[PDB]
RNA sequence: AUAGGUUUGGUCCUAGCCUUUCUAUUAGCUCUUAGUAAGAUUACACAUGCAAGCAUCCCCGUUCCAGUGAGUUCACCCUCUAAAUCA
């Protein structure tokens with residue numbers, strides 16, 4: 001009773017049979033989630049649409065991921081991934097930002113319990129790949145605690161709204177290293193041109209930052 | 216772009232086209248009030264009226280303002296140095 005189901009896609013797939021010719025089947029993608037991190041998805045197939053809905057709904061609950069939510073409202077860090085030909089680039093956002101993402105990601109996020117996030121889907125906009133990719137990235141996100149333990153260092157959060165106050169969000173449960181992490185003068189990191197282009201005010205889009213209903 | 220529709224018996228990939236947003240002109244139909252802003256398609260031809268005077272005569276001004284977008288890297292910086300203002 002805690003879990004809620006929401007349809008993502010309904011497709012009329014067809015095969016050819018010797019006796020009848022075109023045989024119509026229903027392929028249904030559904031996502032189930034209780035809103036507290038536990039969410040899954042499944043594909044249900046049946047000649048009747050009701051049977052397809054049921055099969056997908058009941059099978060999705062046996063394939064539940066657990067999503068680590070930072071402060072139970074957003075992701076811990078920005079996740080960029082490619083699943084097959086679909087690119088999903090998700091950004092961590094502050095409280096009150098909303099779900100500025102593809103309608104399907106909005107639906108899945110509400111089931112997971114993420115309230116604030118931005119995501120841009122590029123490449124193929126296949127619904128199967130998007131869902132499978134979204135759950136792949138969110139499942140693999142590293143929490144602040146896991147980072148502190150791996151690095152043996154404090155994770156200190158700097159917030160602009162709190163000035164210079166150092167907020168320690170995670171500390172290493174084991175021994176704390178005494179050597180500071182080597183500060184590379186120039187980071188050899190791969191930058192997304194779309195990010196850099198926006199930061200330099202070089203991106204004019206009439207469709208970006210349009211006023212939309214509360215999500 | 217938070218995207219959407221569309222190739223096929225069907226699936227996936229790629230791809231073009233189109234949809235949704237925001238402005239400006241024109242057309243159809245329709246139209247109550249007030250304030251404000253803006254306002255020939257045409258460097259085609261133009262009836263008529265007006266748009267430059269001032270002032271003890273000399274001078275000064277009419278080389279400005281206003282208009283248009285035909286032509287088109289004459290517009291910017293540096294160097295140098297006329298005219299002009301500082302009786």
Ligand SMILES: [K+]
Pocket residue numbers: none
């Ligand atoms: K397309």
Ligand SMILES: [K+]
Pocket residue numbers: none
């Ligand atoms: K009209």
Ligand SMILES: [K+]
Pocket residue numbers: 269270275
């Ligand atoms: K005079």
Ligand SMILES: [K+]
Pocket residue numbers: 284
């Ligand atoms: K011109």
Ligand SMILES: [Mg+2]
Pocket residue numbers: none
């Ligand atoms: Mg001189």
